[PDB]
Amino acid sequence: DLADLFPGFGSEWINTSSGRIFARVGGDGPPLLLLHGFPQTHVMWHRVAPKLAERFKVIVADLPGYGWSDMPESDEQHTPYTKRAMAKQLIEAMEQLGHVHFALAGHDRGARVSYRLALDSPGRLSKLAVLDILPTYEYWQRMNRAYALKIYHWSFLAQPAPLPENLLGGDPDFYVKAKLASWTRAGDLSAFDPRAVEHYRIAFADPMRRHVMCEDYRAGAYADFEHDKIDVEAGNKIPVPMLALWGASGIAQSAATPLDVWRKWASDVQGAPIESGHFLPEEAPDQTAEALVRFFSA
Amino acid sequence: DLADLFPGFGSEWINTSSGRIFARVGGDGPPLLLLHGFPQTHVMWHRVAPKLAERFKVIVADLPGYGWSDMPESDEQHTPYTKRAMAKQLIEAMEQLGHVHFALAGHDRGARVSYRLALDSPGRLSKLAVLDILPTYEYWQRMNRAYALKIYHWSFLAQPAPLPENLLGGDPDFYVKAKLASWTRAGDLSAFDPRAVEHYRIAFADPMRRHVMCEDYRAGAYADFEHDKIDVEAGNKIPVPMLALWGASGIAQSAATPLDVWRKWASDVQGAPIESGHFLPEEAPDQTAEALVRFFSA
């Protein structure tokens, strides 16, 4: 029913103290962790992971609570879905594989896990790539009318439960397809492999999966913001070499010029626009893959 | 089935070029137009309108597209649900009753119609009361993280059709009750007459009515903002004596001191907080009715 989009990749259930992380694992060479975002799963990497697997051991993980990874129980402060907790859990998952120093590329929510990981435990990362995000602090700080309309879901999904859970349940298939379509350049689903969309749709069909996504956005509005705020105020920069990729019509370039923003957050950051909407690895897999392989090889 | 909450009030279907306005009509004396907002209907005035009917000809109108008023078909610019168009339609409606000069009190969306009416056609108004709002421009201009979370529905309901409509359609009862409860001081529905809630619920149960509400919010995000922006940047002030009432726990006071804001928009404005959430005429009817009687009688 659900297609295997990573031929030659194994499937691993990585145990952590907070639950299992699901990951497809392929290739050999230095470890490279790939983190998806919302409303996707690891399969969003299916077009770039094979090219990366030529040079790296590629670990394509479902974020905690996403896809087939376990859903740790949340609490009053959405703690397990804060990027800090997710980062700690993925660090632990990587340690189960013996990877204590690895390359990391994240898109959307996974890119927020990624830069928070880079801020909290920089020694874990050889190089970091973030796809089509600015730091969470920067999105909220740039909140204005235009941005509020563009990323309305940042405030919608952060509403107290069960408000977004109830509404998302009103038409989950429409919602996930609408989010996928509206953030591509084309404005429809033609950029996606339909087997990939089926993965995203099935994940989104689970009410517990949707609640987790809301918890993630709740963390995004609260604890994630405060964690970012601490770093901004302390002048903490990401010391890892990092690559910022954004879509020419993605979400990140809607708020500011992404490289200028990331230079305030990272001491060694390169960046390039990709002719694409938000979903760089699916809308522009070749340009995304090439930029990633070049950066992660140096 | 729906209760008559205005014993002794007439019922009128006022024809306008944009469709029929429904209104309850009671009392005698100077004409006083009362405009509800979202997600309510004219019945929200059922506790204060009898007090006002002792001294005024009270016209308790459903907004264009709301309640029992006709729903003009919208367009790509949400024109009929812009506050400018709504104001024009209500001017037409009042003219059908022979009221070319009248007092006006609006709450929520109806308050936005009201101040826009006062800016576009101040000669139509003897006095103006706005209940628990700031100008649409000011909400958007003050859109930061905290406020984007508080009034997320401003950006959510402004999302392109059919996204909000599809989400609202899964369980419309939940949403209307959630919004009613969440903006009251108590955070539940105890402030409302259950017969009134039934009116609100039944109106919200109609997908066309929900569409209109989203159109109203889309206008609120685009053309309404643009019209306000023109006025504020041109320094155009409301010249009609006006009363700004707001709930101490309401929406307007959340991101600004309401009277300071209104003093920028109106040359002759007095204000008073009322111990209440957003729904002043139902949460604090006596206090609201007294403030309005005192103001419109002076």
Author numbering:
A (entry chain B), B (entry chain A): 3 to 300
Question: Which passages does the manuscript contain on this structure?
Answer:
To demonstrate this, data were collected on chips containing FAcD with two different oscillation angles: 1° (Chip 1) and 3° (Chip 2). A complete FAcD dataset required the collection of data from >10 000 crystals, with at least 3318 images used in the final refinement; in this study, with 1° oscillation, we collected 2626 datasets and only 494 were used in the final refinement. On average, 1° of exposure at 10° s−1 led to ∼70 kGy of dose per crystal.
